[PDB]
Amino acid sequence: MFFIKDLSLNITLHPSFFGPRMKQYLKTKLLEEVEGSCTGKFGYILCVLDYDNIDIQRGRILPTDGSAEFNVKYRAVVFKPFKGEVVDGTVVSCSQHGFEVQVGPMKVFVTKHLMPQDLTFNAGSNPPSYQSSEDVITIKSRIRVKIEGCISQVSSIHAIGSIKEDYLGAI
Protein backbone atom coordinates (compact mmCIF):
# COMPACT_ATOMS: atom_id res chain seq x y z
CA MET A 1 0.00 0.00 0.00
CA PHE A 2 2.51 2.65 1.15
CA PHE A 3 4.30 4.13 -1.83
CA ILE A 4 7.55 5.83 -2.85
CA LYS A 5 7.72 8.34 -5.69
CA ASP A 6 10.10 10.80 -7.25
CA LEU A 7 8.85 14.37 -7.09
CA SER A 8 10.23 17.90 -7.24
CA LEU A 9 9.57 21.37 -5.82
CA ASN A 10 9.60 24.98 -6.99
CA ILE A 11 11.23 26.62 -4.00
CA THR A 12 12.16 30.28 -4.21
CA LEU A 13 14.87 31.98 -2.16
CA HIS A 14 15.86 35.47 -0.96
CA PRO A 15 19.31 36.87 -1.99
CA SER A 16 20.19 36.90 1.71
CA PHE A 17 20.77 33.15 1.86
CA PHE A 18 23.24 33.30 -1.04
CA GLY A 19 25.73 32.17 1.56
CA PRO A 20 27.50 28.81 1.64
CA ARG A 21 25.12 26.60 3.64
CA MET A 22 22.39 27.64 1.23
CA LYS A 23 22.16 23.98 0.31
CA GLN A 24 21.13 22.82 3.77
CA TYR A 25 18.61 25.61 4.21
CA LEU A 26 17.09 24.48 0.92
CA LYS A 27 16.95 20.96 2.38
CA THR A 28 15.36 22.18 5.57
CA LYS A 29 12.81 24.48 3.85
CA LEU A 30 11.86 21.58 1.60
CA LEU A 31 11.28 19.40 4.67
CA GLU A 32 9.12 22.16 6.15
CA GLU A 33 6.99 22.51 3.04
CA VAL A 34 6.64 18.83 2.34
CA GLU A 35 7.07 16.56 5.35
CA GLY A 36 3.80 15.27 6.85
CA SER A 37 1.91 17.03 4.08
CA CYS A 38 -1.07 15.90 2.07
CA THR A 39 -2.77 16.52 -1.28
CA GLY A 40 -5.32 14.66 -3.38
CA LYS A 41 -2.68 13.65 -5.92
CA PHE A 42 -0.11 11.53 -4.14
CA GLY A 43 -1.40 11.74 -0.59
CA TYR A 44 0.07 11.80 2.90
CA ILE A 45 3.68 12.69 2.17
CA LEU A 46 5.22 11.08 5.22
CA CYS A 47 8.99 11.59 5.21
CA VAL A 48 11.59 12.44 2.59
CA LEU A 49 14.10 9.76 1.66
CA ASP A 50 17.88 9.62 1.36
CA TYR A 51 18.70 13.00 2.88
CA ASP A 52 22.25 12.89 1.40
CA ASN A 53 21.62 12.68 -2.34
CA ILE A 54 19.02 15.44 -2.45
CA ASP A 55 18.99 16.80 -6.00
CA ILE A 56 19.81 20.50 -6.20
CA GLN A 57 20.65 21.75 -9.71
CA ARG A 58 21.66 25.37 -10.23
CA GLY A 59 18.96 27.94 -9.52
CA ARG A 60 17.59 30.52 -11.93
CA ILE A 61 17.45 34.08 -10.78
CA LEU A 62 14.00 35.72 -11.15
CA PRO A 63 13.70 38.64 -13.61
CA THR A 64 12.98 41.43 -11.13
CA ASP A 65 13.05 40.50 -7.42
CA GLY A 66 16.52 39.28 -6.57
CA SER A 67 15.17 35.86 -5.51
CA ALA A 68 16.20 32.60 -7.15
CA GLU A 69 14.12 29.52 -7.94
CA PHE A 70 15.38 26.02 -7.38
CA ASN A 71 13.64 22.92 -8.67
CA VAL A 72 14.45 20.49 -5.90
CA LYS A 73 14.47 16.98 -7.26
CA TYR A 74 13.76 14.53 -4.43
CA ARG A 75 11.90 11.36 -3.58
CA ALA A 76 9.87 10.26 -0.57
CA VAL A 77 7.72 7.75 1.24
CA VAL A 78 4.00 8.46 1.01
CA PHE A 79 0.57 7.07 1.64
CA LYS A 80 -2.67 7.15 -0.34
CA PRO A 81 -5.62 4.85 0.46
CA PHE A 82 -8.19 3.56 -2.06
CA LYS A 83 -11.70 2.24 -2.57
CA GLY A 84 -12.32 -1.50 -2.16
CA GLU A 85 -9.00 -1.67 -0.30
CA VAL A 86 -8.47 -3.65 2.91
CA VAL A 87 -6.51 -2.37 5.90
CA ASP A 88 -6.78 -3.04 9.62
CA GLY A 89 -6.19 -0.55 12.43
CA THR A 90 -6.86 0.45 16.02
CA VAL A 91 -10.16 2.05 17.03
CA VAL A 92 -10.09 5.71 18.08
CA SER A 93 -13.62 6.95 18.88
CA CYS A 94 -17.22 5.79 19.18
CA SER A 95 -20.69 7.28 18.68
CA GLN A 96 -24.15 5.87 18.07
CA HIS A 97 -24.16 6.00 14.28
CA GLY A 98 -20.86 4.10 14.30
CA PHE A 99 -17.17 4.01 15.21
CA GLU A 100 -13.90 5.42 13.89
CA VAL A 101 -10.56 3.65 13.22
CA GLN A 102 -7.01 5.04 12.85
CA VAL A 103 -4.69 3.65 10.20
CA GLY A 104 -1.49 5.42 9.24
CA PRO A 105 -1.66 9.23 9.62
CA MET A 106 -5.19 8.77 8.37
CA LYS A 107 -8.59 7.84 9.79
CA VAL A 108 -11.12 5.46 8.29
CA PHE A 109 -14.72 5.78 9.52
CA VAL A 110 -17.38 3.07 9.87
CA THR A 111 -21.15 3.62 10.31
CA LYS A 112 -23.36 1.27 12.35
CA HIS A 113 -25.23 -0.11 9.36
CA LEU A 114 -21.85 -1.01 7.87
CA MET A 115 -21.57 -3.69 10.56
CA PRO A 116 -23.15 -7.14 11.13
CA GLN A 117 -26.94 -7.25 10.78
CA ASP A 118 -26.82 -8.46 14.39
CA LEU A 119 -24.07 -6.26 15.82
CA THR A 120 -25.47 -4.06 18.60
CA PHE A 121 -24.61 -0.62 19.97
CA ASN A 122 -23.92 -0.46 23.70
CA ALA A 123 -23.86 3.17 24.85
CA GLY A 124 -24.74 1.92 28.32
CA SER A 125 -21.06 1.09 28.74
CA ASN A 126 -17.75 2.92 29.22
CA PRO A 127 -15.99 3.72 27.13
CA PRO A 128 -18.89 3.19 24.67
CA SER A 129 -18.86 -0.15 22.82
CA TYR A 130 -20.53 -2.46 20.31
CA GLN A 131 -21.91 -5.81 21.48
CA SER A 132 -22.55 -9.17 19.84
CA SER A 133 -22.75 -12.92 20.45
CA GLU A 134 -18.97 -13.23 20.71
CA ASP A 135 -17.83 -9.84 19.44
CA VAL A 136 -17.21 -6.84 21.66
CA ILE A 137 -15.68 -3.93 19.71
CA THR A 138 -14.46 -0.98 21.75
CA ILE A 139 -12.28 2.10 22.22
CA LYS A 140 -9.04 0.28 21.42
CA SER A 141 -9.84 -2.98 19.60
CA ARG A 142 -7.99 -3.74 16.35
CA ILE A 143 -10.17 -4.31 13.28
CA ARG A 144 -9.89 -5.30 9.61
CA VAL A 145 -11.64 -2.70 7.48
CA LYS A 146 -12.71 -2.40 3.85
CA ILE A 147 -12.23 1.23 2.83
CA GLU A 148 -15.36 2.11 0.85
CA GLY A 149 -14.43 5.68 -0.15
CA CYS A 150 -11.91 8.51 0.12
CA ILE A 151 -12.66 12.23 0.35
CA SER A 152 -9.85 14.66 -0.41
CA GLN A 153 -9.87 17.61 1.96
CA VAL A 154 -7.54 20.59 2.42
CA SER A 155 -4.63 18.94 4.25
CA SER A 156 -6.29 15.63 5.12
CA ILE A 157 -7.42 12.48 3.35
CA HIS A 158 -10.37 11.05 5.20
CA ALA A 159 -12.42 7.98 4.39
CA ILE A 160 -15.31 5.62 5.09
CA GLY A 161 -15.45 1.81 5.12
CA SER A 162 -17.06 -1.41 6.32
CA ILE A 163 -16.91 -4.63 8.33
CA LYS A 164 -19.99 -6.36 6.89
CA GLU A 165 -18.17 -8.68 4.47
CA ASP A 166 -16.74 -12.07 5.48
CA TYR A 167 -13.31 -12.35 7.04
CA LEU A 168 -13.79 -8.74 8.14
CA GLY A 169 -14.12 -6.90 11.43
CA ALA A 170 -12.33 -7.38 14.73
CA ILE A 171 -9.30 -9.69 14.88
Partner 1 sequence: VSTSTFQTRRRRLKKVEEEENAATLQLGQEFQLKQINHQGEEEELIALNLSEARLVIKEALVERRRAFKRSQKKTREKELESIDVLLEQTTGGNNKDLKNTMQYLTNFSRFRDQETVGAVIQLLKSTGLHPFEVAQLGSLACDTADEAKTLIPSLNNKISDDELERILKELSNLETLY
Partner 2 sequence: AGRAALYKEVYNVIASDGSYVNYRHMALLVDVMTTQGGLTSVTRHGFNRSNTGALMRCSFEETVEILFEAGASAELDDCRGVSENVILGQMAPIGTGAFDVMIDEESLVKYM
Partner 3 sequence: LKEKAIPKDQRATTPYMTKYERARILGTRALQISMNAPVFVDLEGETDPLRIAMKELAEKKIPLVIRRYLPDGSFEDWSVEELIVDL
Q: Which residues of this protein are in contact with partner 3, per CB under 8 A?
A: 14-16, 18-19, 58, 60-61, 66
Cβ atoms of residues 78 and 45 within 8 Å = yes
Residues that bind partner 1 (CB under 8 A): 1-12, 21, 24, 31-39, 41-42, 44, 46-52, 55, 71, 73, 75, 77, 79-80, 82-90, 102-105, 144, 165-168
Q: Among residues 98, 87, 115, 103, which one has the least CA distance to residue 158?
A: 103
d(CA 33, CA 151): 22
- Binds 55, which of partner 2, partner 1, partner 3, none (CB < 5 to 8 A, cut-off by type)? partner 1
d(CA 69, CA 60): 5
In the chain, the amino acid numbered 92 is V
In the chain, the amino acid numbered 97 is H
Min separation Cβ 131 and partner 1, Å: 25
Side-chain-side CA neighbours of 104 within 13 Å: the count stands at: 22
- Binds 56, which of partner 1, partner 3, partner 2, none (CB < 5 to 8 A, cut-off by type)? partner 2
Cβ-based nearer residue to partner 3, 63 or 84: 63
Q: Does 7 bind partner 2 (CB under 8 A)?
A: no
d(CA 87, CA 18): 47
Strands 68-71 and 10-13: antiparallel
Min separation Cβ 63 and partner 3, Å: 10
Min separation Cβ 147 and partner 1, Å: 10
What is the binding site for partner 2 (CB under 8 A)? 18-20, 22-23, 56-61, 63, 68
